[PDB]
Amino acid sequence: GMNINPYFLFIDVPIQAAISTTFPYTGVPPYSHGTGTGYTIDTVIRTHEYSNKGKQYISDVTGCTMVDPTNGPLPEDNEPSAYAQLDCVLEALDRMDEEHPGLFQAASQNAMETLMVTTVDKLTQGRQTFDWTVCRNQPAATALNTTITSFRLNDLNGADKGGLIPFCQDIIDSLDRPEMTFFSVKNIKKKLFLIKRIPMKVKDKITKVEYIKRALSLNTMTKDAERGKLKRRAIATAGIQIRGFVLVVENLAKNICENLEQSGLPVGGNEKKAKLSNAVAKMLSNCPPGGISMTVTGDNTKWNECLNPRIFLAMTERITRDSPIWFRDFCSIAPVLFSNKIARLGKGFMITSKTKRLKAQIPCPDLFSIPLERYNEETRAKLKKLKPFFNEEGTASLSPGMMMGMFNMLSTVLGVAALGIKNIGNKEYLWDGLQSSDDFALFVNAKDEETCMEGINDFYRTCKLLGINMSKKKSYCNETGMFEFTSMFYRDGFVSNFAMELPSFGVAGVNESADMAIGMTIIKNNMINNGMGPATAQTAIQLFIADYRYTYKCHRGDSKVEGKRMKIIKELWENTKGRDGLLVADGGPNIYNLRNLHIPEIVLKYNLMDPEYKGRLLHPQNPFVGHLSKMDYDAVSGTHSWRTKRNRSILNTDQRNMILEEQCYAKCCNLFEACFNSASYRKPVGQHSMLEAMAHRLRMDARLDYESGRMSKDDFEKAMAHLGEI
């Protein structure tokens, strides 16, 4: 009875050459369920326990319990420590500046110029931002627009200047307003039993301290589809007031990172592979003769929890030493905001009666409104530890840590500065590393293994001095030649890990033609730079076509599959004479192979399509593709480039008022685009009202039409009268 053991494959093929087999990415990624309050409280407790030995005080601005681990007692053990030493960080920054003379000055100049030429529109580049006016999560554009309108209500019109600097000036001025009046969204509950919630937009007002807390508030939720981790984690989103300055800080840190040879950011993909390979080759060639070179594949534990925004404030001040004071203050704002950051604990906890079969949602404001014996043991302990930092309104004071971790570039700079020391006490070791945001690969060259381990220990202690906690559990060391960095496995060269990109091989789910192109191009790129051979590439083509046909119900026209679409597909198959030209979506054959993965489907089959089918498919006025407006333009794409409305229906919630506001904005934008056809392509600039621009454009167009004779004299008179009344 022979027993198959898959791990015996490693007896033949080394782990790195078979690393793809160690990634179970054909399975469903873990998904979080229910509330994320438990994980948020866990991260708050971890941050404060890693910073508890620091100085605890009360903020006189918000009244929150602030903790300051910086300059605190040096850790006496290996637990995650946030007690970064300002002197050590400044020494590391000075060493990096000596290594890179003028790097800080150039980075500050570039960041300042970008900020001066950056517009408020840059704040719309976010997925979900904490909208303080509604105290919820709204798309970044929605949050920015609501903030701008609220600021207008408060006589804060810096956004109208069109630049990011005046809008951020308004942001920091709104903190000084004795009270903030804004547009909020409430809902009327009607019992029909069903409690239908009809939302409407109203006006609300809050005090100065409440607005300050909301601006400093970070809204927490649970991350979904995360892979490689047994337990779920929490994530956080900031507001406009914070992102505004985080943009500039991140840009400065990115300028610094781009000129550091040991930084894995912002480079990525093949550029990152080239940089890392060159760095590894250089560190291999720089090994002293007869010496021992050892690579430490190291991960940093509790990276965001232990990183302190005060240390990042110090880094910002040190970097922007030669900049004008206004830019220094601007860059300092973001670390200041993050040092007073408040964490919204989320949706609260659900309490249930099993015998009575009932459940209820206790929100975060009411978290302590019930005896703690009614929470489970873990939640009970979490609430007991959270109580000192808990805010009565339902939030937690999280002064230490970088929960969101929006300083990826600045944290990379800190890690590289840690790598820049390279030696302590003139000992017989020299370390140089590769530093992504938190993951790192150290390379210590010495005379023997003992001295290499001495150097690794010194690097560990130095990182502890900088607030960086190398993970002993996850970090390991071997002789130079094999290591892992950001899941890139180097074994005398970065091996190809085919499993990581495996989840993207399926139907991208945009539309039939778009998904066809996406799948073919994904196969092509995986062949190019993921080690997928021609046989596996052809098998991937076959599997993508199978999934595509089973997703869009467009099986082969001659096939026996039955469906609502398949009857018409079979009718088309019978009618068509050039069947080889029919698209896969229309039940046509798959003619894709390796050589033509880079050619779109219609282009590939354009000379094989029948004229009748080709004309029907490529009808310039087909109704399945959204047109622009008869005067409506010709939609060049085929009938398969259709759109399914992204219906965000919510049960027992009729968002008619929100839809009405959105459609009002949409109508205004559509009219503006009709007046300015270049608005879609090139962003229209100007400090003047949209109405003024539209009126002037229409007046000029009418005058030109009248002079050229396009418009009749009476029509010109009507146009002039309408414009005058406008």
């Binding site: 229209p684 003024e692 621009a693 002037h696 454009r697 000029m700 005058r703 009248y706 002079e707």
Partner: peptide, 27 residues
């Protein structure tokens, strides 16, 4: 600027002269 715009307007259904001053750059 005020004097220049006033002079331009004094100089000015179909006006002979269209005005390029007294308006934003883009317009």
């Amino acid at each position: 600027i005020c004097v220049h715009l006033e002079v331009c307007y004094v100089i000015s259904l179909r006006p002979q002269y269209e005005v390029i001053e007294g308006m934003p750059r883009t317009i």
